[PDB]
Design a protein around this nucleic acid. Structure first.
Ligand SMILES: C[C@H]1O[C@@H](Oc2ccccc2[N+](=O)[O-])[C@H](O)[C@@H](O)[C@H]1O
Ligand SMILES: C[C@H]1O[C@@H](Oc2ccccc2[N+](=O)[O-])[C@H](O)[C@@H](O)[C@H]1O
Lengths: 328, 330
DNA sequence: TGTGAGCGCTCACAATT
DNA sequence: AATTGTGAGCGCTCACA
């Protein structure tokens, strides 16, 4: 049985409360008293049983996070910025990873997070409107913030402005004089993917352009490669491609190149994310920058505000920007 | 105040213990009684406060994980396979991410994980031998498994066989007839990086070869690009490069290509990891495969065995393999 | 500074029938 | 002999003293 707060009480000549104050950096200590207590716990290697502290009522803002597999780029980047910002605010973070596809899986995840009595949830998992509303409802009394829902979902959410991203992309290709444009989208089961797809159609339409092709990948470079290969093998050869993410763009670029065409000069390409690696593709990839650090930082700040009944309900849009490189 | 075990007690006509039995799938229930209780908690949307269950003494296997930033490839892949395998074993997982560089930071992380009374720790953070031994010592009574230490560290650990990876790389370049070989290593502050560096030197030496260059990156493709550019600008132009990871290899390939040289035909390249993207680099990257799923899966199984006083102490080496692609062709 | 109380549950028994 | 209750406590935080 690990050292208790009681064990330090006698090994310091004080009570369990005296030690408590010391541990909590409380106000009103016997000055030199704290010096003695700390030495007492130091020699016994005392580590406050957080499990007991929480139950006892210690107000510790504990953020829960239901997320897509961390094996995926953006999710990992986001959780990272979340834990980082939470540590910086003295907030704790427990995360439930959802691997199985489906709303039940996400609900299971929210269930456990709730069991750990989190003071708020951050759901970074693709959810259709009613499913999101359902999840939001299951969050018994605790606030929920969503990161993978449409801007049209009636719940608290933060997402990058797909409107701005897709416009930037389309307008860039247009200003370069492209008219034969193909679209490589993320998996349709992804809300974010769908939002980008919609964004492209919206702005391509406003420029009286109709994509000469439209395929669906799964976020992986291999899918980008295969999809762009099938497209080219069907004789459909555009002069520019808008791709849902940098990784698929990479695969597209491989297919283009292994076909005898020059990325840029023959078929321009635009990616999405502006991942670290994108600046070193052959040739450097023009892309839309999504500052994941900012999303994770903002997510935590926001979930805390909500937890404090602060009037900041709704949907928030994060800025993005065009990074001009050599693929266009 | 969320629904208590007490709330179900009267909303079912039983006591808190009766409900407890039903919740824990206990032995000796009133048969139909459990049928009633379950219905009672179902209608009240009851979710057992795990915090209270743990304190009360409920024996649950909770794995703690101190790790390098999840913003890095391998660590994120590893934590994912860890959480995945733990969920599959009905084990819970809490993870403390260490961002600040240093042993104190890692100790801080272990401190918190201990505060949550985990039944074991998985440290995936670069630790020199004495620092690792120190951390291991701080793990008051609970078993610790390390993933970023040397195979020579006297503690429980699991790492990929750098010996096999570097040999595979070196022997491959040699069989292709390369003699002018440059080395691009990961950051020296990384144990894993150093192990690979050592491995290359070891096997290059056994083939009577001396690298004509040896630079250090930081795992990022940009570092791979910059380092390989400085190297080429100094007039040092090898015929093959061994790179500590696929991302730096990417940067190297960019530098090689933007220099008028053909990756493969003029300067061969070998990476490390066999990341998903590596199969789609221009041209496809020959690399050393490190099965991160396997590492995370094995780590959990192993930490649990240790937790059960199973005699499996020491260091374990995981296999790796060479993935031949196009960067070492012609 | 001490004291009382409790957080939600698990134990260990006891207590029902 | 089945089933239920009862007592106690887990480690700490509160509220007071
Ligand atoms: C920043 C956005 O990134 C999307 O990121 C995704 C998700 C998985 C793999 C790659 C990408 N991507 O963009 O390249 C998320 O689905 C969305 O919920 C939001 O987190
Ligand atoms: C599988 C191995 O990967 C190494 O991975 C690293 C670590 C950070 C960024 C990239 C890589 N990498 O290999 O490309 C770890 O340092 C080592 O502890 C172990 O986890």
């Amino acid at each position: 049985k690990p050292v208790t707060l009681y064990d330090v009480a006698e090994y310091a000549g004080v009570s369990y409360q005296t030690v408590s104050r010391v541990v909590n950096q409380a106000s009103h200590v016997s000055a030199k008293t704290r010096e003695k207590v700390e030495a007492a716990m130091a020699e016994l290697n005392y580590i406050p049983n957080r499990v007991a502290q929480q139950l006892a009522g210690k107000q510790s803002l504990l953020i829960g996070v239901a997320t897509s597999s961390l094996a995926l780029h953006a999710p990992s980047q986001i959780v990272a910025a979340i834990k980082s910002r939470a540590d910086q605010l003295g907030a704790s973070v427990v995360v439930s990873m959802v691997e199985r596809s489906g709303v039940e899986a996400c609900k299971t995840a929210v269930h456990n997070l709730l069991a750990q009595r989190v003071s708020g949830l951050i759901i970074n998992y693709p959810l259709d409107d009613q499913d999101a509303i359902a999840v939001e409802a299951a969050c018994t009394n605790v606030p929920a913030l969503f990161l993978d829902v449409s801007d049209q979902t009636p719940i608290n959410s933060i997402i990058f402005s797909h409107e701005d991203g897709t416009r930037l992309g389309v307008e860039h290709l247009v200003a370069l004089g492209h008219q034969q444009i193909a679209l490589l989208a993320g998996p349709l089961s992804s809300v974010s993917a769908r939002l980008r797809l919609a964004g492209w159609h919206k702005y391509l339409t406003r420029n009286q352009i109709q994509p000469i092709a439209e395929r669906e990948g799964d976020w992986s470079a291999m899918s980008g490669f295969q999809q762009t290969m099938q497209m080219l093998n069907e004789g459909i050869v555009p002069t520019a491609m808008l791709v849902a993410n940098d990784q698929m763009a990479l695969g597209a670029m491989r297919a283009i190149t292994e076909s005898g065409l020059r990325v840029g000069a023959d078929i321009s390409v635009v990616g999405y994310d502006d991942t670290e690696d994108s600046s070193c593709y052959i040739p450097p990839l023009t892309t839309i920058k999504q500052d994941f650090r900012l999303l994770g930082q903002t997510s935590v700040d926001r979930l805390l505000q909500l937890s404090q009944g602060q009037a900041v309900k709704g949907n928030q849009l994060l800025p993005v920007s065009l990074v001009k490189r050599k693929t266009t």
